[PDB]
Design an enzyme around this catalytic site. Structure first.
Site, PDB file in Angstrom:
ATOM      1  N   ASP A  13       0.832  -1.190   0.000  1.00 25.08           N
ATOM      2  CA  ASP A  13       0.000   0.000   0.000  1.00 25.08           C
ATOM      3  C   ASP A  13       0.864   1.236   0.000  1.00 25.08           C
ATOM      4  O   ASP A  13       0.620   2.181   0.757  1.00 25.08           O
ATOM      5  CB  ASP A  13      -0.950   0.013   1.204  1.00 25.08           C
ATOM      6  CG  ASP A  13      -2.089   1.019   1.042  1.00 25.08           C
ATOM      7  OD1 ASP A  13      -2.198   1.641  -0.041  1.00 25.08           O
ATOM      8  OD2 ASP A  13      -2.879   1.195   1.993  1.00 25.08           O
ATOM      9  N   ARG A  56      -0.254   8.910   1.224  1.00 32.03           N
ATOM     10  CA  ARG A  56      -0.981   8.859   2.492  1.00 32.03           C
ATOM     11  C   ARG A  56      -0.321   7.926   3.512  1.00 32.03           C
ATOM     12  O   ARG A  56      -0.588   8.018   4.707  1.00 32.03           O
ATOM     13  CB  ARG A  56      -2.429   8.422   2.268  1.00 32.03           C
ATOM     14  CG  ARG A  56      -2.551   7.064   1.582  1.00 32.03           C
ATOM     15  CD  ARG A  56      -3.995   6.613   1.414  1.00 32.03           C
ATOM     16  NE  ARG A  56      -4.019   5.344   0.695  1.00 32.03           N
ATOM     17  CZ  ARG A  56      -3.997   5.232  -0.630  1.00 32.03           C
ATOM     18  NH1 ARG A  56      -3.974   6.310  -1.392  1.00 32.03           N
ATOM     19  NH2 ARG A  56      -3.954   4.040  -1.191  1.00 32.03           N
ATOM     20  N   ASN A  57       0.536   7.022   3.048  1.00 32.41           N
ATOM     21  CA  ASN A  57       1.205   6.115   3.972  1.00 32.41           C
ATOM     22  C   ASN A  57       2.660   6.480   4.230  1.00 32.41           C
ATOM     23  O   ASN A  57       3.381   5.737   4.881  1.00 32.41           O
ATOM     24  CB  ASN A  57       1.091   4.669   3.489  1.00 32.41           C
ATOM     25  CG  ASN A  57      -0.322   4.139   3.605  1.00 32.41           C
ATOM     26  OD1 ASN A  57      -1.028   4.448   4.564  1.00 32.41           O
ATOM     27  ND2 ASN A  57      -0.740   3.337   2.638  1.00 32.41           N
ATOM     28  N   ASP A 110       2.571   3.633   7.651  1.00 28.32           N
ATOM     29  CA  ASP A 110       1.281   3.097   7.264  1.00 28.32           C
ATOM     30  C   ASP A 110       0.297   3.744   8.217  1.00 28.32           C
ATOM     31  O   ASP A 110       0.181   3.339   9.372  1.00 28.32           O
ATOM     32  CB  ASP A 110       1.257   1.572   7.396  1.00 28.32           C
ATOM     33  CG  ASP A 110      -0.003   0.960   6.810  1.00 28.32           C
ATOM     34  OD1 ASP A 110      -0.966   0.713   7.572  1.00 28.32           O
ATOM     35  OD2 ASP A 110      -0.041   0.745   5.578  1.00 28.32           O
TER      36      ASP A 110
HETATM   37  C1  LIG Z   1      -0.609   3.878  13.025  1.00 28.35           C
HETATM   38  C2  LIG Z   1       0.891   4.223  13.115  1.00 28.35           C
HETATM   39  C3  LIG Z   1       1.733   2.968  12.821  1.00 28.35           C
HETATM   40  O1  LIG Z   1       1.685   1.929  13.491  1.00 28.35           O
HETATM   41  N1  LIG Z   1       2.496   3.220  11.721  1.00 28.35           N
HETATM   42  C4  LIG Z   1       3.375   2.304  11.172  1.00 28.35           C
HETATM   43  C5  LIG Z   1       4.786   2.532  11.166  1.00 28.35           C
HETATM   44  C6  LIG Z   1       5.660   1.578  10.594  1.00 28.35           C
HETATM   45  C7  LIG Z   1       5.124   0.392  10.023  1.00 28.35           C
HETATM   46  S1  LIG Z   1       6.193  -0.816   9.286  1.00 28.35           S
HETATM   47  O2  LIG Z   1       7.524  -0.620   9.768  1.00 28.35           O
HETATM   48  O3  LIG Z   1       5.597  -2.113   9.426  1.00 28.35           O
HETATM   49  C8  LIG Z   1       6.191  -0.409   7.537  1.00 28.35           C
HETATM   50  F1  LIG Z   1       6.692   0.813   7.397  1.00 28.35           F
HETATM   51  F2  LIG Z   1       6.962  -1.282   6.923  1.00 28.35           F
HETATM   52  F3  LIG Z   1       4.944  -0.461   7.077  1.00 28.35           F
HETATM   53  C9  LIG Z   1       3.732   0.156  10.028  1.00 28.35           C
HETATM   54  C10 LIG Z   1       2.866   1.104  10.595  1.00 28.35           C
HETATM   55  C11 LIG Z   1       2.279   4.475  11.249  1.00 28.35           C
HETATM   56  O4  LIG Z   1       2.821   4.983  10.269  1.00 28.35           O
HETATM   57  N2  LIG Z   1       1.353   5.090  12.032  1.00 28.35           N
HETATM   58  C12 LIG Z   1       0.833   6.462  11.860  1.00 28.35           C
HETATM   59  C13 LIG Z   1       1.649   7.594  12.498  1.00 28.35           C
HETATM   60  C14 LIG Z   1       2.864   7.350  13.218  1.00 28.35           C
HETATM   61  C15 LIG Z   1       3.571   8.433  13.784  1.00 28.35           C
HETATM   62  N3  LIG Z   1       3.145   9.722  13.671  1.00 28.35           N
HETATM   63  C16 LIG Z   1       1.973  10.048  12.989  1.00 28.35           C
HETATM   64  C17 LIG Z   1       1.519  11.399  12.865  1.00 28.35           C
HETATM   65  C18 LIG Z   1       0.319  11.703  12.160  1.00 28.35           C
HETATM   66  C19 LIG Z   1      -0.444  10.660  11.566  1.00 28.35           C
HETATM   67  C20 LIG Z   1      -0.019   9.308  11.670  1.00 28.35           C
HETATM   68  C21 LIG Z   1       1.196   8.971  12.378  1.00 28.35           C
END
Ligand SMILES: C[C@H]1C(=O)N(c2ccc(S(=O)(=O)C(F)(F)F)cc2)C(=O)N1Cc1ccnc2ccccc12
Length: 293
Positions: free
Chosen positions: A145, A149-150, A163
């Protein structure tokens, strides 16, 4: 190991609604080496969830336990004792890239600057996004994905792969039930993924090309003038996005290389970085996966 004192975590406000539970924003006490306090994003698990769901939560979170890249939002400990299961992560103060790009629009509207956009800035993001993706793919991880947005924006403007994974009613139309079985980001998917529903590193690259298109258009939705079903036919038959207005010729060429029909013919994120590394800021060499050992 990663477990941390839930008492040392204080939630402030809410960022969004997660799958397993509401996502908050707060501060943590001693979660980073040589650091007293640290702004972080709190991920929770609604008590209205059994262990069949709770365990799943810590299953995907352990995946991040192996990640350590400057260009990927980093995990910072986890909570799961005598309270609702929580997970802590680096906080990206400027939010997701799509919202950030969108917030620049009003300024650019009544801004007395009739000069072409900065190719330099766009390349920095491109390389950071491509470096974080190269790291992930190296660890046998396919995103599935990849989209603005991600991607997340740091205080210092650095872009990291993440994400969003929260409610987000503003981007609901970015997904479509191609065959009912789940919401899929059809306007970001490659021809082959639109057919068999399979994602590979080749398709992550195709999506990368679409993110570059998003950056150049300040996040307009891809394939203007076409409904979801029309996008399906168009892309699967070889149709491609058009060169954005005022888009540096070099960026579009990169995009086109990402959109070759034959998946195996698309360049990898490493090859992408190699072809633009000389345009990256000096600091890139210091904290990037590409130059790392
Ligand atoms: C929901 C939260 C979260 O868990 N991840 C996330 C990080 C790394 C990975 S991963 O390593 O598996 C891969 F990257 F591989 F997908 C997967 C998911 C985000 O990006 N988020 C949003 C977020 C975080 C921090 N700050 C924010 C500020 C505003 C909106 C949203 C914010």
């Amino acid at each position: 190991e990663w477990e941390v004192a839930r008492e040392k975590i204080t939630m402030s406000r809410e960022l969004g609604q997660g799958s397993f539970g509401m996502v908050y924003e707060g501060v943590a006490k001693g979660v980073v080496k040589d650091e007293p306090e640290t702004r972080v994003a709190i991920k929770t698990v609604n008590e209205a969830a059994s262990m069949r769901e709770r365990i799943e939560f810590l299953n995907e979170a352990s995946v991040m336990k192996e990640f350590n890249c400057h260009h990927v939002v980093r995990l910072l400990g986890v909570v799961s004792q005598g309270q609702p299961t929580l997970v802590i992560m680096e906080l990206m103060t400027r939010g997701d890239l799509k919202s950030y790009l969108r917030s620049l629009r009003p300024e650019m509207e009544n801004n007395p600057v009739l000069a072409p956009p900065s190719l330099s800035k766009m390349i920095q993001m491109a390389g950071e996004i491509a470096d974080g993706m190269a790291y992930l793919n190296a660890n046998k991880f396919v995103h599935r994905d990849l989209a603005a947005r991600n991607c997340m924006v740091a205080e210092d403007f650095t872009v990291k792969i993440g994400d969003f994974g929260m409610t987000r009613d503003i981007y609901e139309t970015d997904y479509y039930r191609k065959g009912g079985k789940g919401l899929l980001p059809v306007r970001w998917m490659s021809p082959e993924s639109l057919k068999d529903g399979v994602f590979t590193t080749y398709s992550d690259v195709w999506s990368f090309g679409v993110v570059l298109w998003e950056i150049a258009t300040l996040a307009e939705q891809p394939y203007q003038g076409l409904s979801n079903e029309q996008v399906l036919r168009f892309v699967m038959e070889g149709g491609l996005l058009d060169k954005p207005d005022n888009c540096p010729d070099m960026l579009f060429e990169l995009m086109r290389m990402c959109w070759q029909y034959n998946p195996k013919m698309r360049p990898s994120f490493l090859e992408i970085i190699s072809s633009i590394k000389e345009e990256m800021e000096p600091g890139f060499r210091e904290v990037s996966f590409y130059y790392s050992e």
